[PDB]
Structures are given as C-alpha cells and as structure tokens.
Amino acid sequence: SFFTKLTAEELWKGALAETGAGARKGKKKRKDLNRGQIIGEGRSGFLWPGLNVPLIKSGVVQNIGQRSKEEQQKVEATMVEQREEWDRKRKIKVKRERGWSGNTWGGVSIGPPDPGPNGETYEDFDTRILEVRNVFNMTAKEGRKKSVRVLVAVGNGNGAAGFAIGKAADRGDAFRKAKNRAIHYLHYIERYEGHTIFHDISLRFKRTQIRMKKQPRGYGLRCHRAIITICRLIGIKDMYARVTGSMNMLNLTRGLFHGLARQETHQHLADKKGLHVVEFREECGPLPIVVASPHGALSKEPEPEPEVPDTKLDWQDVKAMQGLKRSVWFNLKRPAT
Amino acid sequence: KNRAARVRVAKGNKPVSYEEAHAPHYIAHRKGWLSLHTGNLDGEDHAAERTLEDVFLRKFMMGTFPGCLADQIVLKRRANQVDICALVLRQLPAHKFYFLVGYSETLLSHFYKCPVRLHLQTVPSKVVYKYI
Amino acid sequence: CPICRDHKLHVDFRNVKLLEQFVCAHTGIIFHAPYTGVCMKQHKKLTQAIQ
RNA sequence: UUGGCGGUACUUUAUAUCCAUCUAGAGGAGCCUGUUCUAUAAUCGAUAAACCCCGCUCUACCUCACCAUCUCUUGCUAAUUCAGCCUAUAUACCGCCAUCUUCAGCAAACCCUAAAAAGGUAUUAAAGUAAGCAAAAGAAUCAAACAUAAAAACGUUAGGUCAAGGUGUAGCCA
Ligand SMILES: [K+]
Ligand SMILES: [Mg+2]
Ligand SMILES: [Mg+2]
Ligand SMILES: [Mg+2]
Ligand SMILES: [Mg+2]
Ligand SMILES: [Mg+2]
Ligand SMILES: [Mg+2]
Ligand SMILES: [Mg+2]
After folding, report:
1. Residue C33, C-beta contacts closer than 8 angstroms, at least 6 positions apart
2. Which cysteines are disulphide-bonded (chain C)?
C-alpha cells in the first residue's frame, strides 16, 4: 500500500540500529539514494520540457517525448558507472604523513592553531603531537567514563615555541584545546647563529635527565625522537642530546623548554663579566673571532684562569675520550633529520 | 518516558525548527495546526475523508519536491478550494518550480475534483529556532 | 628512492647542481646512502660522478 | 589518586506512608472476568515490583492470526525469473511506552594550576566565567487563588511490543 511507506531518514534510522541497547553497552553503513537522481528522470525515459530537458531548443518550443529503448539503456548504464565511480571516490583518500610510527600519533602535524580574537592568523606556526593518552575513569554516565589527554607542541621554526595539554572526551576536541592553549605559552629560544644552542645544557627535571650539546653546522639533530620534533619547531638544526632516567613525555617537554629558555647568550656573558667574548674555530686556524663585546665599559682585569678546574664532569662524556669502547648502537647511520 | 513527536536532546549540535522543537502538549498553546478544515468541528461530517486526503497531499508534495521542502506544508480548505502553502529551499532553478507547480496543481485537481492552488515561499535555507 | 622515483633526474658528472645536493656544504663529505635514502646502486653511481 | 559495594543497619528523613491512627474493602459463599494448571485436532503476545477486565473503548459467523478437511498456482499492482509471507531473532532497530519519577540533576565552549591520575568555594569573598537542557515560570481546567491535570532531561531494567505499521539479517515459493 502507498500509505505504509516511510521516508528515507526513518528507514535508515531503523536499519542502521545506531541507537539501541546493544550499541551503547556493546558493519551497516548509511547511503544516500537521492545523490545521483535528477528531478524529472524516470525508468521509462520520458523527457519533460522545463524539468529534465531544455524548454526551448534552437528556437523551437519543445514537447513531451520519450527516449528509445537503446538510448535509455545507455543512460541507465552511465548512471551505474557514475555510482560505481562514486564508490571508488569514497575509497580514495589523500595520504598524510605518519609520525614516529604508523599506528601512533606522536610526531604527526595537525596544522596551525585557530585564528585569534581579532583575526590573528597563525599560518606561520606548525603543531606537532607528542603524546596521546586514552584514559578511562569511573563516572555514572558510562560507569567507566572516557577521556583523551593530548600533549602538543607548536612553533614557527624561528625561535618561538610552546607546549600545552588538552583534555576532552573526543580526540578532535583535545587537539583543538591543546593546540590553541599552546599559542598562549610561547617561549622564545635563543639559537647561536640560528642553528644550535649557545652552550652545553645539562639538567634534571624530576626523574628525567636531559643532556644537550652544542654542535657545529652539518651535524644534524641526533636526539630523542621527541626532541627532534621540538627542535624543528624551535628552529635548531644541529645538536646532540641524551635522555636518561624516566622517559615521561611531559617531564621531557617541560624539562627541555626549562633548559632551552634559561641559557646564556654570548652578549649576556660579555655584559655580566665585562670582557670580550672571542671564538676560536679549528677550521679558521688561530684567527680570533669577536662574537660579543660588552655594551658598556670594557674591563681590564683578566678573568682568573685556574691551573686545574673544579668542573663537575659526566662519566658518559669523558668515557669516550678515555678510549673506552662504545656500544654497538652508538653513531649508527640514520636518515637525515 | 514519552517518545511521541519529541526531537530528543543531542549535545547542542542538532538544529531544530520552531515546529520540531515543541512537543505535542504545546499544540494550541505555542504552535498552531498545520491543517485547517471544518471537518472536526462539532456536528460536522467527513472528518475521515479530510484526514485521508491530507496524508496523501503531504506524501505527494514531498515526492514532487524532493529535498526542496524546508518545513512541513500548511493545508487550508475554504469552501471546496484546497490551498497548499510550503516553505521551499532555493535549490532548484526558478523555471523548474513553475513546471512542478503547474503539474502538481493540475494533477491534484483532477484527483480530488476540487480547485487546488500551490503557494510557495522560498527561503535561502532552513530556519533554525534553536540548537538542541 | 629519490633518484629512481624521478626518471628525469640523471646522475652525471656534468650535472653539478644535482651532485651538490648529495655533498655536505659545510664539511664537503658525501653523505652515506642512509642519510638521503638512495639505493646502493645509485649511491655508488653518485659517488663516482662526484669524484 | 579515584570509583564502588559491604552490615553504610548511625542522625534527620517518607506524608495517604515504613509502623501507629482512621474509613471502606480483599482473604469466607455465590457468580462475572483474567491467568496458571489440567486438557483439546485447535492461536499468538504480556506473565515479580513495572503481568493477571493485559493488546480487546470488546471472539456466535465475520473478526482469525489457530485446527481438520477440499480447492487455487503470475496468485490485489503500471511494470518486474515476479506477487505474497502474523515465517525465526524486541539480544539488529525505527515507532510508541513501562519503571525509578514531579526523582534533580545533565552540563558544551572558554579561563586558571611550580602538571593536571584531577581540581576550580569562601559574600566583611581567596579563580573561575559567560551560554544551553530539565526544574521553576508559562499556558489548560473559560475571574481570583489553591488543587488537579499536563510536564519531567540523562541514565537503570539487551524491561514490553517483528502480531499497529515500517525495517536489517536468515528462511518458504506446487
Ligand atoms: K524498541
Ligand atoms: Mg604499519
Ligand atoms: Mg517476549
Ligand atoms: Mg471464528
Ligand atoms: Mg473461518
Ligand atoms: Mg500464515
Ligand atoms: Mg495558572
Ligand atoms: Mg513546569
């Protein structure tokens, strides 16, 4: 009967069975059947002037007509091809880049942060993921509620970078919250000549030790995969780092920014001590290179040079220079970073 | 819980219209009647026939204007005249509406043997009363 | 690999602009094959062209 | 760090209610009616609270879905190797509901934290804020109130309903 026929929305609602007792506490896919239908087109192949064909053709007011059996079979086959092509389009997708692995979110770009209150675009900033946790708690809504905690980092590759944590029930929301929060906590990291840190940095943040080293050009980033991601956002091109103790991602991000943002530039050192800062490169011979001169008054008392320094040395650093064999894993051939 | 004619709450992302937002108990209080005939007045006849004609006229207009109806149609019977007032989205070209108006009027006048006129108000897009 | 995927790229001693991309600008050392991801056949061919 | 239930039996609490108070009943007899049982060749579903004058505001035929017996094979429609199907799964669902319940919660987007597994109140105020959903309000019972109706989100019971209808999957076509 014509009176027992229901609309498409109600037919798919029942068939999909998305809202149900099984679905909530524990595959059918929806389709649109009006996608390719052109108003005025039927199986019989009639041609309706003003609906599915031109109302006037070559100055002639058209009249009703019907397509031949051969012509209609072509049109039916053509639509079948277009439907089959549409299915192929659904399968096709533009592959985006993986991160540190193929099934992990760490290292994956998610674009720039959203515009600001007064149209402050951040197209020059890139966002990278560092950790994605799917944690479940115990709330009455589901008995065991769902939560997604996302740590992200942002940077323009020109010295400005920041990190934030975003939490939500949906992963997409946790990305937006973290991504837009980090733009409000931008550290500025001082780079020596735009490619490396000004000096060696050793620090302990909670139980995570980081040990960074200043390196010459062309050395590349030989660091923990998370440090490489952040260093690219900061703009550091050449550095070495070692991480020991706990590998907590948050302590490494907090510890990294803590150490990189508390480093002393050469210009600062000249002012603190009042002396010239001179540089000696082995590829330039004995030529002294003046990299920073005190802003105010140059002193005349030479800095005390002890016969034997009391510096606290790391066994790991010294061990190499003592002739001790390194591990089989050290200084392996790796892709360019 | 009552499930009748209630668009249930989502998470604030479902755009319901004025008609959809109001549950049945607001009929005659906040929202009126989509059909207006004299067949349900006291001591009046042919309620069964007017109600059946409306059901068909609603299914006919949906199929004749598929995807072009922004809201439910309003049916107005005066004397033997039937008047169909529908909010229609501006999807189709203008001349296509002139065809569907001429077709749907003539077909429905020869099916119910009454004068039928179609009144179409075109909206740029569906009007959202609230997001629920 | 980068060389093989693009057929128009040719490893010839005269094509210096291509060869320079495989030599360190700062140290002038030819990068090992893992660095750029070239196959061993093309890396050996590149090293001969650079020399 | 949380969530839970354990014996949360403890203090206040219910308001035609747990006991007490009050009135008329049921429980006995006779019938009417539903169910179970027995039973018949002979429906189905509901079947603790939240079934049992329930789907039925309604079964002599019809209704009818049951059983016995006889008959029809393109067998409602414009067309269709199609029509039709009360055939199985309500543990695939839509739809419409019961229930806690006139219970009071459900809370998106932002902001803050010497890091956050989470939390975010102080009024002579100490980090929270500006918006929704329900409640309230409003409207109905044709002055006014009160009362009654209606309303009551999210979850709980894979609760009830494939036999109001539609529908996924599987099954039947002399
Ligand atoms: K149901
Ligand atoms: Mg893989
Ligand atoms: Mg059952
Ligand atoms: Mg009978
Ligand atoms: Mg009979
Ligand atoms: Mg049968
Ligand atoms: Mg009132
Ligand atoms: Mg109210």
Report:
1. A333, C39, C40, C43
2. none
Q: At what angle do helices A249-260 and A225-234 cross, to 10 degrees?
A: 40
Tell me the H-state helices in A223-286: 225-234, 249-260, 266-273
Q: Identify the contact set of chain A against chain C, taking CB-CB distances under 8 A.
A: 216-218, 333-336
> For residue B60, which residues of chain A lie inside 8 Å, CB to CB?
none
**Quick check: do B and C touch, 3+ CB pairs under 8 A?**
no
Statement: the CB of A22 is under 7 Å from strand D: yes
Residue in the block written with tokens 């592959």: A95
Query: How far apart, in Å, do the first and last CA atoms of chain B sit?
Result: 18
**Is-contact A213 A202, C-beta < 8 A?**
no
Cα A245 from Cα A2, distance rounded (Å): 74
**How far apart are the C-alpha atoms of B90 and B104, rounded to whole Å?**
18
Decide: residue A113, CB within 10 A, 0-12 exposed, 13-18 middle, 19+ buried.
Answer: buried
Experimental structure resolution, Å? 3.2
Question: Considering only CA atoms, which of A164, A161, A169, A224 is closest in space to residue A190?
Answer: A161
CA dist list (Å): A75 to A35, A38, A63, B96: 16, 12, 20, 21
Nearest residue to A122 (alpha-carbon basis) of A150, A151, A161 = A161
The secondary structure element, H or E, covering residue A318 is helix A315-321
Q: What 3-state DSSP class applies to A223?
A: coil
